[PDB]
Amino acid sequence: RQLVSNGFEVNLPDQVEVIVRDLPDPSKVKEERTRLMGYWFVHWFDGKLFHLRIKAGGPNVDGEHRAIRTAEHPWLLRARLDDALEEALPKYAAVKKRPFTFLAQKDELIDAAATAAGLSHRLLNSFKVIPRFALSPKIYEPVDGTTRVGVFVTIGMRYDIEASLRDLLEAGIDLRGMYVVRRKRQPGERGLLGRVRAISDDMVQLFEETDLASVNVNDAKLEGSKENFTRCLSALLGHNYKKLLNALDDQEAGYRTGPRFDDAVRRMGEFLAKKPIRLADNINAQVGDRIVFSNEGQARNVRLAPKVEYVFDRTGAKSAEYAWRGLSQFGPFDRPSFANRSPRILVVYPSSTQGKVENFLSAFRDGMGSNYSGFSKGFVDLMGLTKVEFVMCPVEVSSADRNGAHTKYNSAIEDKLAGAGEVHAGIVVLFEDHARLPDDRNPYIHTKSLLLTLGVPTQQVRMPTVLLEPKSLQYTLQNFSIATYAKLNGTPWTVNHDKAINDELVVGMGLAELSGSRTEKRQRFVGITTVFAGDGSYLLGNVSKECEYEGYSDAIRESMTGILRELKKRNNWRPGDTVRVVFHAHRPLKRVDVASIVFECTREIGSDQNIQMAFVTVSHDHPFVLIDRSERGLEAYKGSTARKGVFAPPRGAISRVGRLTRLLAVNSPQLIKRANTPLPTPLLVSLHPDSTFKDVDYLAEQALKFTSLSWRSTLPAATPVTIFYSERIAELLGRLKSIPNWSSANLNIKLKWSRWFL
RNA sequence: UUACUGCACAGGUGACGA
DNA sequence: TCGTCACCTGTGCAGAAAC
Ligand SMILES: [Mg+2]
């Protein structure tokens, strides 16, 4: 019947008296806030400074004396609530403001973990993991037409390595190449200093430096990354350290699992409710009941989307709840039409790995048999092909060769392909030690570049993957097979839709930001992916080949107008037909870009048809969480006492926050990984207010379906493929732009129907 | 770079206004 | 150029595999 939030109602006065000055230049605002500090709350909005007296006595303020009604203008008290919450918790110091963020006063999980695991070390007490709370005042709509303010509670963990760098040297930990940060960030100061080159004498020598190439051991500390935590702890404890991490993980589950998180939110609400929260001397807020999403009374704030159907034929009759179950029993969506039933695949690999690579190829092509039910049949039988021919391309290269590996791979490929005729795809095997070399010598990106230039898509793989134990390998080969088939132009599966309008186009844009190191300013690139409504199905369209960030709005509009022109041509729209266009991204578009896109699409389709357009943001990092108290969870595995996904809403749960915004649950108890996996965060789906198509519940369910459309994996993706695929394209193309001899010429010729970016 | 998931850290950045 | 509300992206480690 209902979903519980992590937020509480805040009962506010109906009205507050304020003084208003015209203040066309916001530059004056800082001086005025300083001058009135203590007696007035000050807030600039729409060219006017608003003044709310908090404490009696001067200084004075001129301007009109207006009443601000909370139901009408909740932004004023929402903002004041940010400062008031801090003030109301004076013993809990702010580590951040707006939203107010602070640490647990006594809890420290490393100490508790160590005691539980039975471990000890004299330096453990300088490694700290402390619960961190934020209280976010947010405007929401308990029903359409009415706004309220709630306070939303979120929990994370502060990871911090307090230890002296001198102390870490002497304990035997190699600090070279570790990132280091300032101990005391002064007001506008950046944190990152650089990487440890050497420790001189009360001085750190730095490379990849952000400012000075050296600094005192006293002004620096290791950044609180998992990399630095694991590097230190494994040397100080290893291999007992893993037991500590499991122990630490158990501690954190005491704050982050459903029932524990729900209890922490409860205890926070109780604490905040105990006293009135002072907005001004005679003006009070009271924190109230937990905010819920329900269909009680005149509220209609929760619904459950139907299960997505994975579709394996053009009729719709062949469908499944899960991708792998469906693929196994039906074969792929395009089996009747798939042109190349005997693909030739180039296999490029270090000559010393020959035996391990043959074992992997055999498992891949011919299957693992019935002892490994995740991958019994093999690629050929799975996908309904006649055979696969491997063209073996050994490379004389060692893992220790960090400067010449890329040149050897590419020479071997060129020499093999010159006397071997046409290949339809490649598998490229890489050493782990080469995987993340700089792009000027990285074999992944150089082989990707050469083969894509030649029109040959590749599926690359690292040796640790090639060596996975059979129980794990079977799942790797599922995912590997799906992407390889799509790289060969295949369509593994589609997802259902019922035709409600005559045509529908969804376009997504995704961002990548590339640099050679953290020091170097990241350059932005974009990708564009298109998806079309089919009869019973969503179909993947063509993808961008140009990736420049400059002018991305023009690229969106060109992609849409050209595609609309071609869909109209193919489908021969009748007068009065409705066409719907949807845009997906992780950030909102500018109003002026929405206007331009609407104008151009409308002109292209013309006055014979009715057009509906929606612009949608999908957000992962926001302060909302959904709790389903009726969800008991599922056994963590067959058949333990532990549970996973306790209080996790079902996949496809959609909650109404406001007119323009829905919360979408994607990670159900089934999909949730382990007993200690936190209560998931839902996706926030936001409609651009200038959209002509207004149905955000439909748009949220559509985003859900598009998570299931990913051909990178059998499991669904974290975000709809319209965005996800675009980010992969942006990253690959932006990287390739810097690689000598790269050409995009074949991306719209031999690779036009290849899903080469998976 | 089989991937899904989670977390952490760092960098900042976007949109709306006047 | 600024106020205001908001959260994006990259990197690295570790546990699982929607029946
Ligand atoms: Mg891939």
The CATH code of the domain that includes A652 is 3.30.420.10
Asked whether strand C has any atom less than 7 Å from the CB of A154, the reply is no
Output the six-digit token pair for A522: 């990241």
By the 8 A CB rule, do A420 and A391 touch? yes
**Integer Cα distance of A736 and A452 in angstroms:** 10
Helices assigned H by DSSP within A184-320: 226-237, 241-256, 258-273
Output the six-digit token pair for A313: 């034929």
By the 8 A CB rule, do A227 and A161 touch? no
Q: Which residue in the block uniquely carries the two structure tokens 């951040």?
A: A96
Burial of residue A1 (CB within 10 Å: 0-12, 13-18, 19+) is: exposed
Among chain A residues 561-620, those with CB within 7 Å of any atom of strand C? 586-587, 617, 619-620
**Integer Cα distance of A476 and A484 in angstroms:** 12
By the 8 A CB rule, do A547 and A730 touch? yes
Asked whether strand B has any atom less than 7 Å from the CB of A190, the reply is yes
Among chain A residues 105-144, those with CB within 7 Å of any atom of strand B? 132
**Integer Cα distance of A503 and A473 in angstroms:** 41
Q: Which residues pair with A129 in a beta bridge?
A: A159
By the 8 A CB rule, do A196 and A175 touch? yes
CA of A463 to C1' of B1 (A): 10
Q: What angle do CA A16, A22, A24 make, to 5 degrees?
A: 130
Among chain A residues 514-573, those with CB within 7 Å of any atom of strand B? 518, 522
**Integer Cα distance of A656 and A141 in angstroms:** 8
Asked whether strand C has any atom less than 7 Å from the CB of A132, the reply is no
Rounded to 5 degrees, φ, ψ at A710 are -70, 130
CA atoms within 13 A on the CB side of A211: 9
Residue nearest to nucleotide C19 (CA to C1'): A325
Local structure of A355: helix, strand or coil: helix
**Integer Cα distance of A516 and A582 in angstroms:** 35
Elucidated via? X-ray
Output the six-digit token pair for A154: 């979120």
CA distances from residue A670 to A242, A306, A634 in whole angstroms, order as listed:
26, 16, 7
Asked whether strand B has any atom less than 7 Å from the CB of A474, the reply is no
CA distances from residue A521 to A232, A440, A513 in whole angstroms, order as listed:
29, 17, 9
Give the residue among A46, A42, A50 at the shortest CA–CA distance from A18: A50
Query: By residue range, what is the domain housing residue A675?
Result: 494-737
